[PDB]
Design a protein around this ligand. Structure first.
Ligand SMILES: O=C(O)C[C@H](NC(=O)CP(=O)(O)O)C(=O)O
Ligand SMILES: O=C(O)C[C@H](NC(=O)CP(=O)(O)O)C(=O)O
Ligand SMILES: O=C(O)C[C@H](NC(=O)CP(=O)(O)O)C(=O)O
Lengths: 290, 290, 290
């Protein structure tokens, strides 16, 4: 039993092992050991990739799957997250995947519950499996992290993606750059140098775009002309290194943080990221259940 | 790869083959060609028959199923339908079933995506699997379409069922009649003769009833005494040909377009339609992935 | 085909049999008689234990599962519950599980539908599988019902649990005590003796707590200090018989009807209830389909 909650508490060796496993499974290697066991997907926030890649991963591992929403479950009757987990243990669930609006919802749980918890996202906190498939995608491309320059752009302080990726990339020996509206920068995220998109887009081996976390803002603010100012425009992408890649955890808001024509251009690895997500998540479930 | 979007682009030959395949599947034919493959059901409008007959179909084919609604997916974050399909492709989905409010949502998709799209309904546009199962049911009854007189009643204007059935029935050599409030007739559906229910009910070999598309009208209008005025009353049903049948795409609004006692009367094939739905949908999936 | 609607129509012999079957199931026994059949779970009210224990039970029986709610189905188009059930029969569903807001929704169905119906809860009416859970857990504890004193506390008026449990308990030879706010007492449930919590907690072999049915009240009222007044406080739990147990159909509102520290205390069988729920529900499904 191993939780996957925060990227900062996962060692370099474990990351290295998870990537190898994921790569092998992607290669065709299979395993049935978990056939018949039960996984529960609890998503209290909207999702497509994370949620359904987990379901695919679970079913490829031969597992039965229970899918829980926040509006149809007894959470409507005031049940706590912990009780929901204990309930799921009681009816035979072996592992739980959770996405929740509350930053660090898992701290209370990991010490109390008896089955592995896989964090599919905690508000603006952590997003471990996104980080892992990001790393995998990067390593597949450059076959190393050391000496890489990776720039993360946009709404940083509301991003569990950036918060997971910045520390671990630095830890793996890469240089991390930030950019975007100064208002949206993170003082709790020092693992990167704040520069401008125009500066970073030329020194970056990786250009990671972020969606604006509109649903997470205290107050809605104008974002007219965001693309020109902060986004990856065609002209900006044309100034990227030959070997550089474009990444984005999705969903993309075409015409906002990236030009519509770039999403599926030569240097884009956005959809490749989604492919790797499945195998990364298969690996993570195996790690969780031994 | 073969999409299924509009009935008007389905050849007479393809139709006949789908009906034959459906019959074989109905009579127990099976194979594991599709076992373990993934099907995704994207339903953005309510549904019971189409959605779940598809799920049953997919599972009888031995497929793994993913169910997406639109309020719990990342469409909520602004993701386009196109990006949603590509996302599903990336994670290993082989076929997508889509029901959407936007007429012809699929026109954009079919030229761009790399997996079969099965249209489960586009606003007031087309509803091909309904048409196919309607044809199957009629064919089981008369072993022919040539010379048949089929009347379609009620809210034609907002009916993707009427749109699909009218063109294809006349194309198959049937005579089509329309009835219902003149206000709800469709000038862009000229494949039938407009008459009154009272006339059509004695001339018809098939009486096809439609539900009022309340949720699709620009503004709500009274519908008091609809049954007596426009609907299939007991008195009207008693004037039907001895060998004529009653059909309805469902759900039925008992007391509106049809008298409560008729839904499961001798001449009714309403539930037989739902039965055929599964096999028609199996056949369509087999066609898409051949 | 044996429906399960209300406890009062379930004989003592049928009950003892379901409990023996659930025990054998709980010990690991299974068979293949239901492999590949279809179960449908129609939940129109929120639920965690009942809905997902049913799904688990179903999967453990080797069945395919269809999950329907209220907002995404064609109930939205005005389809009656009856037509919904008949529709499911037509597409190949062998048994239906239903939780609905309308008391006794099932009495118009039992005489009309052609497949077994399993009531997962009808408004403030009955909750048969919960009751069976309770009986099982109670029987596991004391190995008998005769001579037992069982107290049920709180919002009796709006409890389908209390209604199922009260009669069947006294029928099995146990004495039932009632407790809680006098306004929330039920005149349509006279199978117990109203007393104060402080009294019952000392004379009870089983102390069964109920959640306040806030979502079911015609008018909201204050419930300040509910714990200290009507609930199971730490102080009160200390005065329980040595061999007595705490039960609660869940979910619990920690701090309302029970002190936070008692939910998982030595005398609590609340989570054991959830465990037995699966096997009871397996047994009930086996009974429904012969
Ligand atoms: O939604 C974001 O922009 C980033 C990130 N996106 C994803 O995880 C992909 P999805 O919401 O389709 O599961 C996340 O934090 O949820
Ligand atoms: O909704 C109508 O009345 C006709 C038709 N109905 C169906 O296809 C059946 P369902 O909505 O239960 O899947 C449709 O256009 O969606
Ligand atoms: O809800 C209650 O407090 C009692 C009872 N609770 C249960 O059945 C458990 P659940 O709602 O998680 O399935 C019921 O009537 O729904």
């Amino acid at each position: 039993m191993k939780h996957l909650t925060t990227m900062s508490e996962l060692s370099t060796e474990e990351i290295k092992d998870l990537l190898q496993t994921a790569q092998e499974l992607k290669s065709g290697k299979t395993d049935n050991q978990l056939t018949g066991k039960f996984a529960a997907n609890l998503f209290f926030e909207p999702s497509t990739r994370t949620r359904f890649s987990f379901e695919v991963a679970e079913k490829k591992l031969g597992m039965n799957v229970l899918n829980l929403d926040g509006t149809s479950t007894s959470v409507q009757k005031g049940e706590t997250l912990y009780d929901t987990i204990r309930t799921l243990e009681s009816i035979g669930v072996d592992v739980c995947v959770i996405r929740h609006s509350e930053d660090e919802y898992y701290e209370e749980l990991v010490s109390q519950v008896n089955i592995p918890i896989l964090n599919a996202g905690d508000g603006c906190g952590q997003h471990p499996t996104q980080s892992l498939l990001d790393l995998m995608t990067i390593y597949e491309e450059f076959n190393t992290f050391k000496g890489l320059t990776v720039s993360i752009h946009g709404d940083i302080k509301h991003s569990r993606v950036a918060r997971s990726n910045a520390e671990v990339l630095t830890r793996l020996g890469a240089r991390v750059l930030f950019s975007g509206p100064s208002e949206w920068q993170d003082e709790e995220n020092t693992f990167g140098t704040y520069v401008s998109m125009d500066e970073a887009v030329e020194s970056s081996d990786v250009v990671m775009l972020l969606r604006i976390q509109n649903e997470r803002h205290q107050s809605a603010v104008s974002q007219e002309g965001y693309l020109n100012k902060y986004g990856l425009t065609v002209e900006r992408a044309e100034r990227m290194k030959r070997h550089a890649i474009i990444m984005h955890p999705a969903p993309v808001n075409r015409g906002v943080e990236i030009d519509d024509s770039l999403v599926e251009s030569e240097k884009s690895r956005i959809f490749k990221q989604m492919k790797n997500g499945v195998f990364i998540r298969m690996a993570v479930i195996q790690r969780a259940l031994q």
